[PDB]
Design a binder for this molecule. Structure first.
Ligand SMILES: CC(=O)N[C@H]1[C@H]([C@H](O)[C@H](O)CO)O[C@@](O[C@H]2[C@@H](O)[C@@H](CO)O[C@@H](O[C@H]3[C@H](O)[C@@H](O)[C@H](O)O[C@@H]3CO)[C@@H]2O)(C(=O)O)C[C@@H]1O
Ligand SMILES: CC(=O)N[C@H]1[C@H]([C@H](O)[C@H](O)CO)O[C@@](O[C@H]2[C@@H](O)[C@@H](CO)O[C@@H](O[C@H]3[C@H](O)[C@@H](O)[C@H](O)O[C@@H]3CO)[C@@H]2O)(C(=O)O)C[C@@H]1O
Ligand SMILES: CC(=O)N[C@H]1[C@H]([C@H](O)[C@H](O)CO)O[C@@](O[C@H]2[C@@H](O)[C@@H](CO)O[C@@H](O[C@H]3[C@H](O)[C@@H](O)[C@H](O)O[C@@H]3CO)[C@@H]2O)(C(=O)O)C[C@@H]1O
Ligand SMILES: CC(=O)N[C@H]1[C@H]([C@H](O)[C@H](O)CO)O[C@@](O[C@H]2[C@@H](O)[C@@H](CO)O[C@@H](O[C@H]3[C@H](O)[C@@H](O)[C@H](O)O[C@@H]3CO)[C@@H]2O)(C(=O)O)C[C@@H]1O
Ligand SMILES: [Ca+2]
Ligand SMILES: [Ca+2]
Ligand SMILES: [Ca+2]
Ligand SMILES: [Ca+2]
Ligand SMILES: [Ca+2]
Lengths: 270, 270, 269, 269, 270
């Protein structure tokens, strides 16, 4: 679609806000361990790697419906909502500042417990359509739960780049992060931003503020354009691993807030 | 409230300073371990987790009364104090540079003792009303002391985002950091800045200088506006954990200094 | 070659995109451990050090053929000039995995240690092969003969031997522990590398589609593609995987490139 | 004083330079362990904590007498204004030493553990003594009477007691664990500090002669030297050296200052 | 000498390149462990600390002879070469990415070996005369090899700043880093840049690129001026410690490349 100028005048700007709850494996709000995975079940061998669905963190996604812009669809030009900037925040960070939760002792049984630590993964995206994904796994011989969306008919090539392994992030809590990542060869109409630090016991590091805005405009001054007046918000915020007294382990996630400013953009009627 | 222009002229600027003492759990200045929590008392299980009030760090808050500005409340326009910038500093940082305090030896009994280390959490906020808070916990089955302000009738939803778990930071030493964090969906009239590094034994890192100012104006050039001529200052500065000889542990906190510059802002009378 | 002005007008600009699969040692897509090295075989001594080819990560290289620009007698020619690149290490979140068969973090009730330790990231974009300098940990290492390594090593190759030079002209052949970008050459290539060592170091990576690197030099000139060929080179070693028996495999990830090129006028030589 | 404009013309600018040696506890240059604290002596309990004077790092301070500027009648006077400073921790590379007596890294065939753990770096440049705020880890600690510490301590002193104030007016007398710069004062000093804690943390330091710190405030005014005196203050604890017996000493390094000053006109008070 | 303006015109700019090989202790290219120190030999006691020359890393220095500028030395003004900017690079960084070198196992005898790690020291300097040095040691009772250049007649004062402990970096592989550092009270005619990270097992961190230039001009816009048409390049690049199977240890250094751009500067004839 040919993109023209920004539409000026009163009522040309709008703003939405939303939060996405984490989807660490216990994904129902009545689950005792909502916001965590179940105890990790580890592969027995290369050939026998059957991770339980509840142990696998997935991506969060929400579709926000925006006000309808075009009365009749037959004028030479149309309007689309253009995402211009976002304020985003990982919520409840200070919940990890807690040394009394049941778990593994830091020293002996007189000490506090080890807080959430280890691998972290933070991703947010804002687009005018679903986030486009690339499949890649640690091991093609893992058998994934069938009620999740994973790579069909995996082979060892899927341990690196197979250009046939593509998907859309179109379902909340279904696409495992260990299988899918943002596809940089597409996503022309989405801006995504991601951060990873690995390790078993790494100290998690996070900032929180209401003073920072990310501008979503591309090199040409154009932000994501919302097809069918729909805005797509995606996230994952794995903040580390909680270790229990018995040494079993649960992934821990946190929710993410989005505040997106949008404006009206003229496009040519296709 | 329709915000208008900055009032210029002599005496249009004022400046306040304040310090907030840490509320680590021992919050009475006659407490032997004032500036620390009591020995952390750890849950025996998921179901049984009763942290003592003295073991839970809370937010500091102070209200600064500013000179009154409006004689007539008849006038078509009124003046409010607008917070423009802040210098803020964590005080007594070098008190941590101490290897003789009674505790746990670094190596054997000929060595110095382990200094304060582990999880850190730093936050300051400057606003024209109480900081708005969102509740989220590590465990919804925790029983919090009834004399603290925490989430009423928790369910497992409270381990992630429950949109009903909201509060105002309107009491000093009452809101546990492990339960509450700044709400990014509100706080239009407060600037907050936060930094977290987790981990069991992580070395703390801190800077101190009198050369750095934070500017508090939003993207329209408007800082926090002080309702009823009150300026709200909030903080928490957990600098880590002290470990005792028996391996019991206390949170350690430090005081925070604020120097705030304010100016007169014209607003439309409501 | 004398470099003249940029050629303006419609069709003055083109873009390409490619990805390079990692070459960690298992370099065939049907290899069970594709994207990993084989179990590291360690030297029993300084004198006795014969690493298997499957255990030695090598540089990835791709040559992209660009639209033919030039008749070859005009007094000025056109060359494709690489102006900027968006590049991305793909599959980063694949490391966010605690269930893979391996070594337990704590006892046997816990998750397994994820990929961690030494990392090496390099990308380059050039108008000819990346020029290489040879330097090794040990000059007494015997390398696999079917790889390209330093000929007739002496202890001088543990430091700078001005004679140990090569071109990155084959994919999966030049070991990273032998070869590195030659800063005394490479006038026509831009390279960018970072290294963090250690055995257990947590890996750190970012991913976004918002970042572009400008390739122009201090005279405003990017790499100029000789014979309309664009050279893309990479290595992305994201750490070490540890197996249950404590054997270890290097782990690598693929890299994406999106390069923008413009027509540059040059004086005919 | 009412501060007026900068005085221009020939000879309006000056430079001084100085070094301050560290005061870690062994503060006499003939001390066998000069530049180190004596072996750390640890408290037996909350009630009993009697650190020896020689175990407690203190701030360094020097007063530089500047050229006499003024007669005192004139409606306006000149003061030296500290404009900028180049400052350097000297002898950083002295830490790059694994043969020194100490605790083995692995077994007795290995090198010894180098200086590591808690570090504290501070420098200040002002026109009067640095103003200090008292705060300690323990109010029941008994400090050496020959040092300057907080009078009549109570548990409030484990946090902010607004009465606990002092001036850094003596070299090697004010313990860093008792005093820090007071941000509620120090209008006429600029101070800069960084702290990293932990018991075994690797120290990190840079050294260059290319970096200057500008000392002007948001009104373009630097510290003004009362009575033509310039105050330089510092502490540079670079970590802890551990002996074979596992007893431990703080290690400090000297700091160099090069300050540029100019003449500032002020109203006679 | 009085420094005047930059000389303009054709042929006013020259460019040199050079490499400096590391001087870790095994400093002869035929040495089996060239580019490493010999096994560290640890002090028996404070009184008995005799490090072997081969165990002590020294600075690298090279003198580059530049084209002769002044035809008649009686003219009232003269030209000097002025170092304007440098591109510099540590070479062979990726040689460290090697887990099969003989050494100490990361885990048991089935694993890779521990790569080079621990204390790093990086310095480069570009000057128009020898880099000026200040003496400072960890221990004044250390007995250094007489074949090296160290502090004469050490006393305890040399554990801190002795103003009489000065030297010039005027010989390659002779001035140990543990005794000498750049003197900030001098070096008006040299620019030096240094970086240190200690510890015994710290991961080394290095970058490499050909896209970065350091500008050498001072605040008056004057770079180092090459006395007698000599350009002084100095370096040390200790990238860590290699541990052998028997647990003995060797410093590891890497060579450094320089590409310095120079221009002609007018000076008044003294
Ligand atoms: C992430 C998180 O919140 N982890 C909890 C865990 C988990 O709920 C559990 O591991 C499932 O993943 O529970 C922790 O406490 C449990 C632990 O102390 C075990 C003993 O190791 O006992 C459990 O209670 C038992 C009780 O002991 C028995 O008398 C009874 O038969 O059953 C109870 C419930 O099964 C504790 O809940 C843990 O450390 O694993 C606390 C963590 O914070
Ligand atoms: C990078 C990676 O994927 N590593 C795998 C490894 C490698 O595939 C393997 O080390 C070759 O380099 O395999 C891991 O699982 C193996 C391990 O559990 C060993 C026990 O030490 O047994 C292997 O299965 C055997 C099995 O024991 C026999 O019954 C069978 O007949 O032969 C099988 C094949 O050898 C496991 O596959 C590993 O931890 O080493 C899992 C890693 O994820
Ligand atoms: C933050 C802080 O200052 N921690 C102290 C602690 C705390 O005061 C205490 O743990 C309460 O939270 O005390 C430390 O010293 C005590 C320790 O040596 C214990 C031995 O386990 O003894 C205590 O003194 C006892 C004494 O031993 C008895 O004879 C007497 O009957 O009672 C005394 C007081 O209970 C020490 O105070 C500690 O290591 O726990 C020192 C820390 O710095
Ligand atoms: C920096 C470096 O490359 N270190 C080497 C070292 C050094 O060359 C050496 O330690 C002197 O600094 O050698 C390493 O391999 C040796 C090691 O396995 C030892 C056993 O601890 O044996 C040496 O070979 C011996 C062999 O074992 C004997 O049977 C024979 O009689 O003598 C041989 C030579 O002494 C190995 O060379 C090491 O681990 O120390 C490998 C390091 O990479
Ligand atoms: Ca594409
Ligand atoms: Ca809102
Ligand atoms: Ca060259
Ligand atoms: Ca004040
Ligand atoms: Ca001097």
């Amino acid at each position: 679609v040919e993109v023209l100028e920004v539409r000026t005048g009163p009522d040309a700007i709008t703003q939405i806000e939303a939060y996405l709850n984490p989807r660490m494996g216990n994904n129902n709000p009545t689950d005792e361990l909502y916001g965590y995975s179940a105890d990790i079940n580890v592969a027995s061998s290369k050939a026998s790697d059957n991770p339980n669905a509840t142990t696998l963190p997935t991506y969060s996604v929400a579709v926000i419906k925006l006000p309808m812009l075009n009365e009749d669809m037959t004028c030479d030009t149309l309007l689309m909502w253009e995402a211009v900037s976002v304020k985003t925040e990982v919520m409840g960070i200070s919940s990890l500042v807690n040394l009394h939760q049941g778990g593994k002792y830091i020293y002996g049984s007189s000490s506090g417990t080890i807080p959430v630590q280890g691998t972290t993964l933070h991703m947010f995206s804002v687009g005018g359509e679903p986030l486009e994904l690339q499949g890649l796994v640690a091991s093609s011989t893992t058998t994934y739960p069938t009620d999740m969306v994973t790579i069909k008919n995996m082979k060892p090539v899927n341990q690196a780049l197979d250009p046939n392994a593509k998907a859309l992030l179109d379902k909340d809590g279904k696409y495992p992060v260990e299988v899918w990542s943002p596809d940089p060869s597409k996503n022309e109409n989405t801006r995504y931003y991601g951060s990873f630090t690995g390790g078993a016991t790494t100290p998690p590091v996070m900032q929180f503020t209401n003073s920072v805005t990310t501008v979503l405009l591309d090199e040409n001054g154009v932000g994501p354009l919302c097809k069918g007046d729909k805005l797509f918000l995606s996230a994952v915020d794995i903040v580390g691993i909680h270790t229990n007294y018995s040494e079993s382990q649960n992934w821990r996630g946190l929710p993410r807030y989005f505040n997106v400013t949008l404006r009206k953009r003229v496009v040519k009627n296709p």
